[PDB]
Structure formats: C-alpha cells, structure tokens
Design a binder for these strands. Structure first.
Length: 65
RNA sequence: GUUAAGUUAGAAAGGGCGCACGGUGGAUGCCUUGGCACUAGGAGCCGAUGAAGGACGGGACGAACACCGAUAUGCUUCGGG
C-alpha cells in the first residue's frame, strides 16, 4: 500500500487519514475492553498502517530540505 | 510306691553370628550444553548532532528472559532466498 501512500498528496496523507485510523483504533480498544471484539488482528494491522503513514510524511519533510 | 544319682537341656521376655529380601543416600562408570592455553589474520577508541551505564514502558490472554521506544514483539529502501 506504500505506492498508494505516495500517490496521495501531503495534507490528504494526514488530514482525514491518520485521524480516521486514530479514531478507529480508539473504538477498537473500547470494544475489546468491554468484552466483544471477536477479530483481534485489527489492532496490530491498524497500528502498522499508522506507522507507515508517519514514516512517509517524515521522509517527504526531510527530503524537502 | 520310697531313696540316691546323673542328663542332653529345653523353653527365649529379648539378644549374637551366617544367609535371603527391601528402604534411605548420591560415590563410581559412560556422556556434554560450558570452560583453559595458544596459532594465523583484522581492528585498536566512543561523546553537546548528547556517550558508557541505567529507570519506566510496549503482545489478544499473567509474572520473568530476549527484542524494541508513544511509528514501541516494530517502519521504509536496496540485494539474497
């Protein structure tokens, strides 16, 4: 998904992207705490996706100078 | 029936010697995951762009070892497989 990450422009790669993933992780952890989640690999894959987005943004910023 | 006299003893409450069968306890034999002494090549410094060394944390489900820092049991890119 890294290529698709590059294709998006910078604001789109943070605004309404690293925010929806954050809120989804929040809801997922709430459901797990309550006691009804079933599928549990979602947490790990969401966290990995967030890290990917942050790293590509930082790479762009570093290359900009 | 009465005198007189001899006797292995022969019993064993328990004990000694020999034999048979067990229990505790880790010598001996066999075996290495760890060490000891060297040889031939390399490398002989790290740090304010924050060191050597640590504290606290990170997993779906506890404590500990190993691994990693709010991008936390991991992220990109180039090669091997």
């Amino acid at each position: 998904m890294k290529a698709n990450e590059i294709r998006d422009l910078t604001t789109a790669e943070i605004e309404q992207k690293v925010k929806s993933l954050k809120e989804e992780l929040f809801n997922l952890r709430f459901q797990l705490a309550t006691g009804q989640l079933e599928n549990t690999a979602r947490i790990r894959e969401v966290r990995k996706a967030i890290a990917r987005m942050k790293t590509v943004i930082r790479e762009r910023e570093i290359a900009a100078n």
